[PDB]
Design a protein around this nucleic acid. Structure first.
Ligand SMILES: [Mn+2]
Ligand SMILES: [Mn+2]
Ligand SMILES: [Mn+2]
Ligand SMILES: [Mn+2]
Ligand SMILES: [Mn+2]
Ligand SMILES: [Mn+2]
Ligand SMILES: [Mn+2]
Ligand SMILES: [Mn+2]
Ligand SMILES: [Mn+2]
Ligand SMILES: [Mn+2]
Ligand SMILES: [Mn+2]
Ligand SMILES: [Mn+2]
Ligand SMILES: [Mn+2]
Ligand SMILES: [Mn+2]
Lengths: 82, 99, 105, 94, 99, 87, 106, 97
DNA sequence: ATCAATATCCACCTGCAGATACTACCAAAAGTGTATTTGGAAACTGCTCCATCAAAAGGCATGTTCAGCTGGATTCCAGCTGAACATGCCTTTTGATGGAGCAGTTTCCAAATACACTTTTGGTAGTATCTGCAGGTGGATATTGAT
DNA sequence: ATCAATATCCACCTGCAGATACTACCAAAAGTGTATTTGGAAACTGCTCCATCAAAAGGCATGTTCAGCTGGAATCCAGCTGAACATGCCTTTTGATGGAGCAGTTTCCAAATACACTTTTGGTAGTATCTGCAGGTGGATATTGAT
């Protein structure tokens, strides 16, 4: 069956995320709203990561590329180098 | 009559379950598909370290969970117990992620 | 030959902290005291977290500190939580917390 | 092949000093490494700006101290300052 | 028969007035006393450049104005038109000033 | 030979109409009575944190005079960058 | 006759000064000759962008002298300058006129 | 005693103002803002370029580092034009002497 | 109150992935010793500007009265979203397998640094003189609210 | 719709704060030229680890039904909060003075850089042994929701 990739981020997985966030009841429109927010996040972080990749003249996005990008965006991540 | 839990009971059960654990909650492969698709828009024929993709999923899931907490506070502020796009939007606005 | 760490009473590497400072382009010069002080501050902060994380491991009846324990240690401590407020710990999860109005009855 | 430095074995030393019978997983060791690297960068960075603001070319223990006061919350700053002063004192005498 | 504008009319007039201008809204000398009192509690025998106090007042007024904006959105979210302390608290929580 | 009078309770110099005006510039139409004391508390926290950092810069330079730059540097690190007084 | 590096680059902004500030700033051990040129050009371009928009705001306010208010109007009304300076306070700049619709009478 | 020289970007900001708005002036407080702006953006780009060079074990900040820093730091159209203006200035600079 | 249906917890057990303890190897890095350079503390002091003074006055804070209309409580009900169950679809596992490409090594030259010398310039400093617009007045237009 | 009270607009003007203009001065800055050093690009390549492949295995996502209960709409009203007024206080303004302390300049040594050499160490690679605990079991018992 034909399938968009962002639609691969399924309703039940979004549900579990909300539950860890302490959310008890979810509106039907939340699931499309969440996917849109997810996409912007990834776009912003991946754009910065790939930019580090290009500068290093590589073809492989490294964990460090991602880590540096997250730090830029004020989303510092522990556990993957640096 | 067959057994049936009241609405909200099982929801509360899930909250306790996932707030106790630390495993990722999005399927690995669909997430990996999404990452490569988005990356392809910035540069073609890219490869990814496995740790790179995992770093992305960790940061992204930690972000959505945090956002959902703030969303929940907004819903409760309006005397609701159901989160709505209205609530996500307010949280992101106040966070400075937009408008 | 006695290492500067030994000479200062530290487990953390003074010589390395010094090399990292001057190769880091933080300034033209680096005083001899600076890497000692900094190595000391880093060791102490490491000790404070490992202490609290160890206790978290004990409470869960474990003997090996895992990421989850580091998270519990930090988020349950007012000052460590503030210092690391914009940091996410991989495989750390969140604190058990449910808004009161969501509880039944 | 080349080598990659980390704080791992120094982290482990400090671990056995505070919890002799406690171990630490490699994933958790990665986090401690990130922690030490992060705080180093923060403190060094702030000390750098301090020296520059005052038209100084040297970063001394004085810059490190003010940087720590600026960066760490109340009690953490107090103890860190004390630990720092203690180590520089015992380094002058020894 | 003496003239009265309805409740809300003058308030809207005032919004338009102050969103149009840029001058400081807190009295100058009282703010200066506040700064000296707070600074003194931290360190005795301090002196202030006049521009230093003004820098503090520009920062404080810009901070508060921005906070009232976010506060207003929280109140409207609750279907109110009146800002309340819980609105300020919600805004500061999401901002990460108390979280 | 002298010392200035005791400085106390100056937070009340942040008057209700002053707080009303700031709310107006912030687009606020209607204000509950408890807002004014809440605002004073919030302002005091903000001012303390900035002044603490500014004075810290002052002492490090071995001065007795808080400069505009001390404040600007303090604001910069608190994530409240300010144009118009500085470097 | 000597030529400035600025004139050699076709720039109004000072290349020599920018080069000095890079070395004096402890950003790296070495600084290439192309680096201050590129940086001076970017700084100049951004200055031109803001002054353009601020000059328009001044004109719309029937003024010929740009004041901080005009700089603020130009920045907050431009989506990209607003993003770039989103964590910046312009002294004596005030805010944009903006009243939430639900507040208006009806 | 002569008070030390306080450098600013004023005379350059003023030049660009005249290119852009020939009949428009600028107050000293507004010029103060402009000076804060240039210094801020200088520091952001330089700082980002510094990190960039350090991540890649390079001891030299070249025009290449500045460009990537500008792409990382500026949004969309601003990055596009800034990069263009910067490239253009470098090629012209090197095509001389 | 009883009582049935699940969920949840505790004690114990066992396989294994990941922690560990070991010996050996070595390049880099840290310690040592010596000669050289220099940053910035001291001392001294010129001079900006901060604290404090007085005095007059009107902009604005305070405190009160009055009632418009907002917030909060109550009720009520349509329909949305949770729970449960039945499918079946594709994520996961892992194991092997090219080979892309990260990364280590060698070569070497364009470009950077160091330095001495010459010239240009941007920043006070001292006065001297325009000029944009703040703030005042007056009178025509618009807005708001009662009726 | 009419009309009256009041805010709002805009033209016109005047005083002046602040911007513009000029000359003089000059220390630092910027450029030029020569000699010397070396960062890192280029080319080749070995070895890591990434992409893909098959292929069950089944765990988990999807579609559906049903109804519990939440969200939102409607209604009411006590009292909070806005508007307006009277009163007069304290902030604002203008200007002067003394001197605290910031800052400019010069002297001078403790400490830091720069090499050369020696020694220690931390990262490493196999190689073998060890173990904390995830995951599975049973059965006690707590929770939930029907009566
Ligand atoms: Mn006090
Ligand atoms: Mn010197
Ligand atoms: Mn009434
Ligand atoms: Mn209402
Ligand atoms: Mn190849
Ligand atoms: Mn000149
Ligand atoms: Mn006017
Ligand atoms: Mn080389
Ligand atoms: Mn029903
Ligand atoms: Mn309800
Ligand atoms: Mn009074
Ligand atoms: Mn004195
Ligand atoms: Mn060893
Ligand atoms: Mn278990």
């Amino acid at each position: 069956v034909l399938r968009d990739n962002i639609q691969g981020i399924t309703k039940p997985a979004i549900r579990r995320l909300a539950r860890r966030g302490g959310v008890k009841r979810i509106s039907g429109l939340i699931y499309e709203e969440t996917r849109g927010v997810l996409k912007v996040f990834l776009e912003n972080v991946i754009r910065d990561a790939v930019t580090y990749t290009e500068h290093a003249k590589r073809k492989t996005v490294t964990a460090m590329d991602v880590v540096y990008a997250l730090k830029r965006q004020g989303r510092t991540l522990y556990g993957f180098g640096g | 009559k067959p057994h049936r839990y009241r609405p909200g009971t099982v929801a509360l059960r899930e909250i306790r379950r996932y707030q106790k654990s630390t495993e990722l909650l999005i399927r690995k492969l669909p997430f990996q598909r999404l990452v490569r698709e988005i990356a392809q828009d910035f540069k073609t024929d890219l490869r990814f370290q496995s740790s790179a993709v995992m770093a992305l999923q960790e940061a992204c899931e930690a972000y959505l969970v945090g956002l959902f907490e703030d969303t929940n506070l907004c819903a409760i502020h309006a005397k609701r117990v159901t989160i709505m796009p209205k609530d996500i939007q307010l949280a992101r606005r106040i966070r400075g992620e937009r408008a | 030959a006695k290492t500067r760490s030994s000479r200062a009473g530290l487990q953390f590497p003074v010589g390395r902290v010094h090399r990292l400072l001057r190769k880091g382009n933080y300034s033209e010069r680096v005083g001899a005291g600076a890497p000692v002080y900094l190595a000391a501050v880093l060791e102490y902060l490491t000790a404070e977290i490992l202490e609290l994380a160890g206790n978290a491991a004990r409470d869960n009846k474990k003997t090996r500190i895992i990421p989850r324990h580091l998270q519990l240690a930090i988020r349950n401590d007012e000052e460590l939580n503030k210092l690391l407020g914009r940091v996410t710990i991989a495989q750390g999860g969140v604190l058990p917390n449910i808004q009161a109005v969501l509880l039944p009855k | 092949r080349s080598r990659k430095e980390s704080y791992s074995i120094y982290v482990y030393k400090v671990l056995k000093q505070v919890h002799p019978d406690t171990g630490i997983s490699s994933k958790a060791m990665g986090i401690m490494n990130s922690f030490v690297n992060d705080i180093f960068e923060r403190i060094a960075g702030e000390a750098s700006r301090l020296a520059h603001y005052n038209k100084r070319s040297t970063i001394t223990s004085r810059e490190i101290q003010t940087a720590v006061r600026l960066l760490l919350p109340g009690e953490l700053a107090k103890h860190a300052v004390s630990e720092g002063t203690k180590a520089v004192t015992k380094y002058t005498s020894a």
